[PDB]
């Protein structure tokens, strides 16, 4: 998965 | 597709949602993640010394628009991934509106995350006082002052890759044979540069697994992520079990279990039993549903593609509906 700041 | 309109393609299972976005004259076609958790447009480009071989490169050479800037920037997302390069300054079209001059960000470093990814780079949707430099404008901010979207909002269907994937992203406006009855307004806290919401409660059946909890929308998250009280409560729910690693391990078969539904702003809005299963390997799933030691949730694509979503960059607030489906 990705946890985009 | 019509004007400011901009289909998108689901990545695996739903991990990500890119687009395409020309940049430079004449262009070229990037896919850029869209991402309401963050503010920067950033690319791949040929001054990259660790990119993917695969990446579409902005060619600075090749755009007779671009124009060189002696800023340099550096970017860290949530889960550590990071990018670094220069500033430029050059056209962009977001489905057939063409902003120009705007503020474009070329990477000369990238994690390998990034360099074996399917995107060229992000397109940042969050509000600019977290632009990672002082003074940019954000594609929003521009699109807004060079007078190409009417009303401040982009609407936002986020598909499933078990209905055939897609998604479409329009700026100025929004598309209601996505969604299922009434839209629900809902207030946003941006003081943090996020789409932050307020959810009511969250229930599992007659179950209360959580009483009021901030979250931010992000498109550019895949899971749900919560504080760690609520996670615990919530797999308690589902008998899932904590794989010690912000993830759990959930039942593949979602057959029994009750949708996870968020009160928000006097509605109701759910995780569908079919997003609870995130991914499946070798038979085993990971649940759709995560940790993170933060006191806010994430609210991610597990969320997002239950719930078509207008963002209000000018208010700001969000208007809300279950999808149609």
Redesign the interface.
Known sequence: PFHXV | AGVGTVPMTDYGND??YYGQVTIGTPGKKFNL?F??????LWIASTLCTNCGSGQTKYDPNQSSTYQADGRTWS?????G?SASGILAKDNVNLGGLLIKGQTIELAKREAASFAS?PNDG?L?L?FDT?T?VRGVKTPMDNLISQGLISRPIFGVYLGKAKNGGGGEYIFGGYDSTKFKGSLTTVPIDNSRGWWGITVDRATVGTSTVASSFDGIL??????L?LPNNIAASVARAYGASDNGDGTYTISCDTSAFKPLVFSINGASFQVSPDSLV?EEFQGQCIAGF?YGNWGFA?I?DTFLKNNYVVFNQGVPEVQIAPVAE
């Open positions: 991990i990500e993640d991402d309401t958790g963050s503010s920067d970017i860290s997302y949530g889960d991934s990814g992000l940042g969050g977290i990672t992000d498109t550019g998250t895949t899971l992520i995130f995560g994430i991610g």
